[PDB]
Design a protein around this ligand. Structure first.
Ligand SMILES: Nc1ncnc2c1ncn2[C@@H]1O[C@H](COP(=O)(O)OP(=O)(O)OP(=O)(O)O)[C@@H](O)[C@H]1O
Ligand SMILES: Nc1ncnc2c1ncn2[C@@H]1O[C@H](COP(=O)(O)OP(=O)(O)OP(=O)(O)O)[C@@H](O)[C@H]1O
Ligand SMILES: [Mg+2]
Ligand SMILES: [Mg+2]
Lengths: 108, 102, 70, 395, 405
């Protein structure tokens, strides 16, 4: 969170490496903790409003486990297009809200 | 003769069916709803029988409502026009030009 | 439906009946066996019921295998 | 015009989409008072229709053998009947007192819930729910008047600690009197805007009722509902409607209205303590009020809204010409001097007419000449209809 | 036990009435047919296209019980039939209220979820289930017969062109009842609220009602007309109650223009049917004082009052803030009298021997009503003789009928 505030919207290379490093180093059970939700925000904060500079970052989020990957993929993608109004991105967002799950899998 | 006999036996059962209320239509509503005033029991919002056209349910019309569902099922003959009733109590003598002199 | 596209983006005239044949009371008047068959009914086949069939030939008798009751 | 063909194409699609959205969501009826389906909890409503039985409103009259373990309650079920019933097992015996409305079921009529006292719907509508858009900054020349008004009707509720420590009982009543247009209702509107307690606006003509004793009833229920609040403010605008002095003209002249005034006097200062109610009355005819109503303990403070002085008139001119498109050197002190004895209402009209002359001349800025003509039209030309000369004798 | 506490602030209904509901699409600017408007128009369409797809997907996998037509059908089952009409006495809680049926029996019933809760106010007509009496709807109150009396459904056919000589009077009355609505920017750029009230006073027949009729013809606002004598009621408090209800209809039909014609007739005429004497009239006036300028915030209501006796009014009634403008209607002069004769003889066919100059000096204190009365009686005289052309003899016998005898 803090490093995200210092490097908000800057796409700082150094913080991206370590935030990604921490995210995949944590365990499957460790990512279950809701405090783990903050690590994606730090990565998301760095790319606040940058736009399409995340496909490299989003590719890195592929390797991490579920359902944390789905949450991390959604969050950082959102902060990428903050204040952009890109309806195509909002189109994806509503599709994620479309499919309901009978909580743990629907945290994203 | 047989139908006359049959109608008589069924009449005894039919007479035991509860009678219909008499109400006055305030205003017709959407979805075949009507605002009526049952004589002693105030106002109701009622459904309309499938054999009664909602366009014929005019305001200030006398209607018959079912016992339990209060459903508008018959358009009773219209009551006395309030203007007519007002002119009965005033009772101004009717006149023509032939009965006026000078 | 997929995602919405945003701004940018010949009854036969006959039917053969095996033996035994479930024949209606009305089928009897219209049901008649083929001419070329080796069996010919003794009484008219429109009467119905159990009918004994004359054998024109003396070939191997192809019978109907009995079925056990349920 | 090049996009005219395409704009209508997308406008019609939006309308078609909007209608199609209403087909699935549902925006209709609204004449049987149906809420939009987003708030529809059908599953809960089905449960309420069975789990929660309906309760008939009844008033407890007497408790029989309250000391014993079999306390029996006599209830008056409005126009239905009277029943001797026992209390339900899901409410406490000490929660039901004689003379209090209760909710009873339809089967055994056992009391299921106590209910608030019955209040006339007209009396319920008297409490202010949306505060006015007027602050004390919109009242000019009433500096001493406001401080006296605030320290009785605002300060005790805002900072009650400063009065309990010194053993001080602040006044619970203020009478605002003055000629029409002097700011009596304007100050009360500022009070309601600033107040945090319940504010009830009562016009004296609202207390005049067709039937005998009905006007006094509304005064009783008004103070009954004011007492259901920790701190309350009742505003009696134009109290001269019901506050007139008692008299005997042989016939029963104003006998009914005098009873309403007698009820109001009783609630203000009678055998029972009034409560935390701080009343506030405004009238342009204070000479007509009864001596009992004009007595301390009912109207402790008598704040006079006299016509503004030169400093006050210049202040009211500044208030009303604040948002105007005035010129450079509008001599507002001179304009205040051209209307010696003029209410703040005339000053506002002078400001309105001054800009009204500018609109007449298709001019965007109001000059000093426009104000000079406005003073002539309002203060001078309209002096035939001036209510001031007749009403200073009354105040 | 503890009393239930509402979550809604207050006991009154929402002030907004008759809105666009959920059809309140964002206001797209500019109205000019340009790409920016096209881009904004597509922008609204894009979200709707998302909205259509999203809502359809949910309802597709929604249970058969939970469907838009099924839930509506379930609402009718919950409401039942018949639907009793009651009165809201008190809102005890958000989902609980005290209601009274037509027989006067009160019940402590539950407000169901589908009820429009922001239409709930004490004294309102509520719809209750027949069996359990639970609140199941709110009856949209029909237009009161009292509303129909005030409202002028069809604008009068009298225009400003049919008024002659009242050029200043039209100009002053337009600026307080017409200009603020047609061009409200003039008042906003100046920072002045429009002149609050207006009173039209003068001798009888001078055109006070006529100018109000011309105002009603060219107004986009609701026009309510009440004669001052109609405020004298047969029961105590009804007069004040009626003045209170008249401006309540004005509030609902905002913007509105209330025309209190013959306001002086409320006090200059004494009727034995008025139980309270001058004292009830005073209370009726005090209600009128509050409505014009009082504690309650006034919406877009412009008040026009007319009187031929302005000296008999309470001076506090027409004080500034209540009635800002006092427009006088003098008896016409020679130039105006000629115009009035031309106005009322325009559709006439006249004889070559008739002259309006001689008809000008029929009487020194000649009003427009007398001028019009001369014409209609002159035409009636021509009608008696089975003629379409009005002669000077017809006008001569016209003057001796209306002005004299
Ligand atoms: N002291 C003041 N400062 C500023 N504006 C004022 C002042 N006094 C009056 N006004 C203006 O004049 C108007 C007169 O209305 P107001 O409610 O104040 O009159 P009032 O004193 O209650 O009269 P009435 O006795 O006829 O009820 C106010 O709405 C306000 O715009
Ligand atoms: N200045 C005028 N120009 C044209 N017609 C006029 C004029 N003054 C009066 N009239 C005519 O006189 C008729 C009657 O007058 P009107 O009803 O307007 O009277 P008023 O001024 O309201 O007076 P009051 O109610 O005191 O009798 C109008 O219908 C109109 O045709
Ligand atoms: Mg006032
Ligand atoms: Mg008139």
């Amino acid at each position: 969170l803090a490093c995200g505030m210092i490097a908000v919207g800057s796409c700082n290379g150094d913080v991206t490496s370590t935030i990604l490093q921490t995210i995949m180093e944590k365990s499957e059970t460790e990512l279950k903790d809701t405090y783990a939700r903050w690590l994606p925000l730090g990565l998301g904060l760095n790319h606040l409003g940058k736009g399409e500079a995340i496909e490299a970052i989003l590719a890195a989020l592929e390797v991490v486990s579920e359902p944390f990957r789905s949450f991390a993929n959604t969050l950082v993608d959102v902060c990428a297009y903050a204040g952009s109004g890109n309806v195509l991105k909002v189109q994806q967002l509503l599709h994620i809200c479309s499919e309901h799950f009978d909580a743990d899998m629907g945290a994203h | 003769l047989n139908a006359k006999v049959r109608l008589l036996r069924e009449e005894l059962q039919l007479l035991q069916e509860q009678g219909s209320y008499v109400g006055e239509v305030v205003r017709a509503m959407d979805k075949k709803k009507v605002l009526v005033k049952v004589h002693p029991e105030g106002k109701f919002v009622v459904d309309v029988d499938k054999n009664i056209d909602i366009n014929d349910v005019t305001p200030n019309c006398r209607v018959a409502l079912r016992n339990d569902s209060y459903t508008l099922h018959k358009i009773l003959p219209n009551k006395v026009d309030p203007l007519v009733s007002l002119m009965m109590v005033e009772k101004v003598p009717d006149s023509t030009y032939e009965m006026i002199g000078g | 439906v997929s995602t919405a596209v945003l701004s940018i983006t010949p009854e036969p005239n006959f039917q053969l009946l095996d033996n035994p044949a479930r024949v209606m009371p009305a089928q009897l008047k219209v049901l008649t066996m083929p001419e070329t068959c080796r069996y010919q009914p003794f009484k008219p086949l429109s009467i119905g019921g159990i009918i004994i069939l004359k054998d024109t030939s003396e070939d191997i008798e192809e019978l109907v295998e009995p079925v056990a009751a349920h | 015009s090049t996009y005219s063909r395409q704009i209508k194409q997308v406008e019609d699609d939006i309308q078609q989409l909007l209608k199609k959205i209403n087909e699935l969501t549902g925006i209709k009826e609204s004449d049987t008072g149906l809420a939009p389906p987003a708030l529809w909890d059908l599953a809960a409503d089905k449960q309420t229709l069975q789990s929660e039985q309906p309760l008939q409103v009844a008033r407890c009259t007497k408790i029989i053998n309250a000391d014993s373990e079999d306390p029996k309650y006599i209830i008056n079920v409005k126009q239905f009947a009277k029943f001797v019933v026992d209390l339900s097992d899901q409410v406490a015996p000490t929660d039901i007192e004689e003379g209090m409305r209760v909710g009873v079921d339809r089967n055994k009529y056992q009391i299921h819930i106590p209910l608030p006292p019955k209040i006339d719907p007209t009396v319920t509508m008297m409490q202010v729910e949306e505060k006015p858009d007027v602050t004390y900054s919109d009242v000019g020349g009433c500096k001493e008047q406001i401080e006296k008004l605030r320290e009785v009707v605002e300060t005790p509720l805002l900072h009650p600690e400063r009065f309990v420590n010194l053993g001080i009982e602040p006044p619970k009543g203020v009478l605002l009197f003055g000629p029409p247009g002097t700011g009596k209702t304007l100050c009360a509107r500022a009070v309601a805007n600033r107040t945090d307690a319940c504010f009830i606006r009562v016009i004296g003509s609202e207390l005049v009722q067709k039937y005998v004793g009905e006007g006094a009833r509304m005064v009783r229920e008004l103070f009954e509902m004011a007492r259901t609040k920790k701190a309350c403010l009742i505003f009696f605008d134009e109290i001269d409607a019901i506050g007139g002095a008692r008299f005997d003209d042989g016939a029963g002249g104003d006998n009914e209205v005098q009873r309403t005034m007698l009820e109001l006097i009783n609630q203000l200062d009678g055998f029972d303590p009034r409560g935390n109610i701080k009343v506030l009355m405004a009238t342009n005819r204070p000479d007509t009020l009864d001596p009992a109503l004009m007595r301390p303990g009912r109207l402790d403070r008598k704040i006079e809204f006299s016509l503004p002085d030169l400093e006050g008139r210049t202040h009211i001119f500044k208030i009303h010409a604040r948002s105007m498109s005035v010129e450079r050197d509008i001599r507002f002190e001179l304009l205040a001097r051209l209307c010696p004895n003029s209410t703040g209402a005339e000053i506002r009209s002078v400001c309105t007419e001054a800009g009204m002359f500018a609109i007449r001349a298709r001019r965007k800025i109001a000059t000093e000449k426009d104000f000079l003509e406005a003073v002539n039209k309002v203060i001078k030309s309209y002096a035939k209809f001036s209510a001031t000369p007749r009403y200073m004798t009354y105040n | 036990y503890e009393p239930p506490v509402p979550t809604r602030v207050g006991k009154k209904k929402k002030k907004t009435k008759g809105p666009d509901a959920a059809s309140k699409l964002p206001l797209v600017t500019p109205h000019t047919q340009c790409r920016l408007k096209l881009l904004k128009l597509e922008r609204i369409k894009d979200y709707l296209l998302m909205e259509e797809e999203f809502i359809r997907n949910q309802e597709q996998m929604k249970p058969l019980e939970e469907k838009q037509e099924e839930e509506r059908s379930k609402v009718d089952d919950l409401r039942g039939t018949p639907m009793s009409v009651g009165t809201l006495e008190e809102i005890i809680d958000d989902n609980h209220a005290i209601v009274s049926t037509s027989v006067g029996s009160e019940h402590y019933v539950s407000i169901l979820s589908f009820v429009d809760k922001d239409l709930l106010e004490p004294g309102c007509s509520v719809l209750l289930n027949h069996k359990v009496h639970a609140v199941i709807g709110v009856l949209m109150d029909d237009t009161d017969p009292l509303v129909t009396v005030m409202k002028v459904e069809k604008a009068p056919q009298e225009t400003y062109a049919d008024i002659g000589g009242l050029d200043n009077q039209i100009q002053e009355i337009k600026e307080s009842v017409e200009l603020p609505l047609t061009h409200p920017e003039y008042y906003e750029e100046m920072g002045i609220k429009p002149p609050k009230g207006v009173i039209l006073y003068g001798p009888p027949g001078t055109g006070k009602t006529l100018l109000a009729k011309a105002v009603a013809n060219q107004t986009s606002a609701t026009f309510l007309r009440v004669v001052g004598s109609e405020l004298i009621q047969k029961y105590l408090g009804d007069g004040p109650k009626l003045v209170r209800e008249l401006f309540r209809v004005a509030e609902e039909h905002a913007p509105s223009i209330v025309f209190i014609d013959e306001i002086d007739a409320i006090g200059t005429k004494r009727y034995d049917s008025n139980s309270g004497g001058e004292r009830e009239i005073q209370r009726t006036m005090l209600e009128l004082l509050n409505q014009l300028d009082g504690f309650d915030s006034r919406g877009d209501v412009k008040v026009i009052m007319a009187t031929n006796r302005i000296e008999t009014l309470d001076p506090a009634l027409i004080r500034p803030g209540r009635i800002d403008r006092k427009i006088e209607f003098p008896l016409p002069d020679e130039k105006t009298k000629k115009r009035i004769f031309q106005i009322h003889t325009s559709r006439m066919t006249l004889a070559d021997d008739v002259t309006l100059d001689d008809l000008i000096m029929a009487k020194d204190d000649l009003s427009g009503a007398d001028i019009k009365a001369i014409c209609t009686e002159a035409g009636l005289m021509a009608l008696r003789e089975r003629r379409m052309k009005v002669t000077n003899e017809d006008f001569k016998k016209s003057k001796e009928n209306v002005l004299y005898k």
